[PDB]
Design a protein around this ligand. Structure first.
Ligand SMILES: N[C@@H](Cc1ccc(O)cc1)C(=O)O
Ligand SMILES: N[C@@H](Cc1ccc(O)cc1)C(=O)O
Lengths: 317, 317
């Protein structure tokens, strides 16, 4: 209702399986929602913050978030939003990366709350021990090859090429939703823009096994110049302060172009509408002051690294 | 060389991955070959005899045959030669059927021979305990969706529809060949006409994992009238004497149309070329005698049920 209207205002809603059905439910019950994160490196990056902070927003509005670490799926690899087949990482690598990722995820959510404390989960726990036969029969029987081929992630790659490995990824993500739906009463899955297919696959599986649940996607973060959000000359802006220092993190945000600053405040910060609006007027009236930029920089650096880290960043600058 | 030339003469060769390469090898070494049989009922039927007897021919020429009971794959189901998606049978059902099938297979092969005694195997043993992750990575990475879609069995069904379950079957059969190649030095796989794709899939996997082996298919048994071989008014002609009695079995063969009799003698019997030719001349000169038909009937009933069974069939008639 107002949560969803707020996300809309912020521009955090790309698509929704059924807006009125979801608004209703959000408004009538404490909803268990989840977001999955695959270890593709030893650290998350700014590419994951939209999803992370959106979970947080959901939690603040009284819902219960489940952060899913892709221990199993990170061993397969999601073709979604990828133009090329990826290289398979080793079990040891993925296993090691999952542990770190788990740590950074925890920073953004509340574990102390009673009623809606978060949960961090690893899909390795239910996918790890699943036998191929069970998988092909219990999950696979539910999907025709024709439904799967039409998926953006696959459609986008058939000429380019895609192994059966990556083609099947959707089944696993599908399965995650079902399992979470069953064991945790999970009724909503959220994710970036590229996850639509995987999410809807999950819904198809629930529907076909149960005959209820929703999916929401966040839009790709845009730049006025048409370049790739987070594509720096320095390389990736990581959430690990040992890869990307708080100073570098801080600088990154401080250098937001005037064109993007207001979309980024809405996306990445917990400033109200009236605060965000006031900054817009300040942006208009005194753009050399860079008030929108400092506010973004401090807000986001505090979120991710904390005040002390922010304090250093400021004094280093 | 002569084995292969003989099969050719008989019309037991539909296709071959590389005839000269296979002829060479057959002629230079004791070849380990295999044929897989999926429990789709509690008994084999006359639809499986071409493959079975061909194994036997291979064994008689000094090669070692491996009869594979599809304990695992029989739980997935092969779309090959099927116009429609099949219903999944239960583990208990399949398990029970595998045991029977194992029994009928054993009748046709030699276990006493030293140098080339047969082996009966069950793919449940290596597929049963395989985890989905291992499967998607170790087997799946080797196949593009584009290679698999072009397969006759899939191509033939995309509009009609095919689940991911049946679509993946080829991977399992693929895997069987690899495993048998590795543990038993299996260099040749044989099967009916509809297995070409599954066989070649196996070869693709070996090639891609090892960088040697061959595939041979038997043609669909034809009728001059253009009807379906084995399609009786009575229903299936089973190899279990409790489903189809030796008398009924015997009768079935005795009623072979003059048009087919000679193709069936070549296919299903161990009569020489000169014996088969002589019967052709007898067929020409005295077709009301039905000498070709009696010979077929006795030869095949003896093979499958034995002399005593044949003796009863004859006296019952
Ligand atoms: N596929 C998502 C991560 C994910 C993994 C498993 C899930 O169940 C959900 C999401 C990505 O690549 O970002
Ligand atoms: N697919 C074959 C049987 C088979 C099973 C497993 C194999 O490895 C080989 C063959 C059939 O349906 O008749």
């Amino acid at each position: 209702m107002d949560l969803l209207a707020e996300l809309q205002w912020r521009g955090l809603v790309n698509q929704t399986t059924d807006e009125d059905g979801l608004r209703k439910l959000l408004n009538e019950e404490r909803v268990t929602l989840y977001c999955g994160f695959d270890p593709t490196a030893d650290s998350l990056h700014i590419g994951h913050l939209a999803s992370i902070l959106t979970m947080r927003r959901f939690q603040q509005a009284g819902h219960r978030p489940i952060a899913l670490v892709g221990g199993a799926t990170g061993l397969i690899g999601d073709p979604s939003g990828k133009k090329s087949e990826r290289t398979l990482n080793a079990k040891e690598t993925v296993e090691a990366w999952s542990a770190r990722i788990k740590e950074q995820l925890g920073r953004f959510l509340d574990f102390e709350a009673d009623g809606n404390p978060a949960k961090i989960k690893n899909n390795y726990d239910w996918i790890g021990p699943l036998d191929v036969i069970t998988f092909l029969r219990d999950v696979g029987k539910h999907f025709s090859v024709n439904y799967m081929m039409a998926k953006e992630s696959v459609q986008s790659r058939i000429e380019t090429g895609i192994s059966f490995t990556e083609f099947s990824y959707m089944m696993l993500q599908a399965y995650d939703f079902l399992r979470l739906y069953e064991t945790e009463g999970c009724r909503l899955q959220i994710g970036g823009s590229d996850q639509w297919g995987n999410i809807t696959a999950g819904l198809e599986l629930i529907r076909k096994t149960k005959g209820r649940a929703f999916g929401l996607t966040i839009p790709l973060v845009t730049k006025a110049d048409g370049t790739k959000f987070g594509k720096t000359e320095s390389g990736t802006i990581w959430l690990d302060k040992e890869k990307t220092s708080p100073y570098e993190f801080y600088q990154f945000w401080i250098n937001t172009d005037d064109r993007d600053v207001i979309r980024y405040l809405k996306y990445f910060t917990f400033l109200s509408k009236e605060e965000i609006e006031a900054l817009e007027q300040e942006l208009r009236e005194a753009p050399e002051k860079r008030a929108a930029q400092k506010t973004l920089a401090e807000e986001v650096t505090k979120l991710v690294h904390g005040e002390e880290a922010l304090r250093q960043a400021i004094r280093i600058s």
